Amino acid sequence: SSPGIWQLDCTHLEGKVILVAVHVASGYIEAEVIPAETGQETAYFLLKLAGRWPVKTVHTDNGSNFTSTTVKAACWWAGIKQEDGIPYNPQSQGVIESMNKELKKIIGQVRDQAEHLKTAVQMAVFIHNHKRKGGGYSAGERIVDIIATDIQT
Amino acid sequence: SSPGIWQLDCTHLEGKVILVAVHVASGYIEAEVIPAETGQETAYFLLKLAGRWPVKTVHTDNGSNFTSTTVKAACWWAGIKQEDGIPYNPQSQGVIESMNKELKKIIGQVRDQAEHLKTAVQMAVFIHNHKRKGGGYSAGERIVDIIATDIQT
């Protein structure tokens, strides 16, 4: 639940991979399309993410990325504690499956407006992060308020 | 705004283009390497940026991107007001030249640790956003505080 905890989530669409990082406490996401989930892509995506948000802990999405020496190199470089993504509380997993289904639905709703899947995915990141949940807050609002509160201290 | 104002900046290294968005009030940046600055690339980069931060105004980096139909379509889609980037304030310009030189210096300092230019650029984005400047705050801390303060009004 802390401000720096993220979860990696890899889902498939149109024979391609969508890599998602979710900020567990807020539901805020960043996502990319990649031809396939290799250590190198995962490493690069974490590096990008950690340059943009204070990523302290990452729950890796599978044991291959947990093992990967490139992923471990990027976590070391960027000051990130790599953890497994084992859902010791089971509702965690249902939350992810639900987000994957939500995102693919958004992708479907914008698919026409975008020539490449990668554009549709960024439109879906946009809609997802701005959606007011519930005076309800968006995930965008939440992540910023969580990290600002954390900074003060 | 201020909280929502971003400036686009395009700089070259190794025959490649580095596209940068700077959050004016904090100095926080996001950046990408692209083969060349076209409207489509710039459009896609803005869509990614606006799905991640609440981007209200962008000062475009040149009149081609200002004019571009695709850039205008992305700005319309993501709710962004496009403006020219003319240094009405002249110190604005020198501020950017100095960041470009600073990013390039970081790039040179990490270039060895990275096979690809895109990796070195993301390392530089990381070092830039985390640097305390410095009881000194980082650009990452500033942008979060600026937007949190804004959400609480």
Ligand SMILES: O=C(O)CCc1ccc2c(c1)OCO2
């Ligand atoms: O330092 C903190 O815990 C929060 C500050 C912060 C916010 C965004 C960042 C960042 C640091 O590094 C780059 O993106």
Ligand SMILES: O=C(O)CCc1ccc2c(c1)OCO2
């Ligand atoms: O809503 C605001 O003014 C700030 C909240 C916020 C923060 C990050 C976001 C976002 C919205 O949408 C994209 O990523």
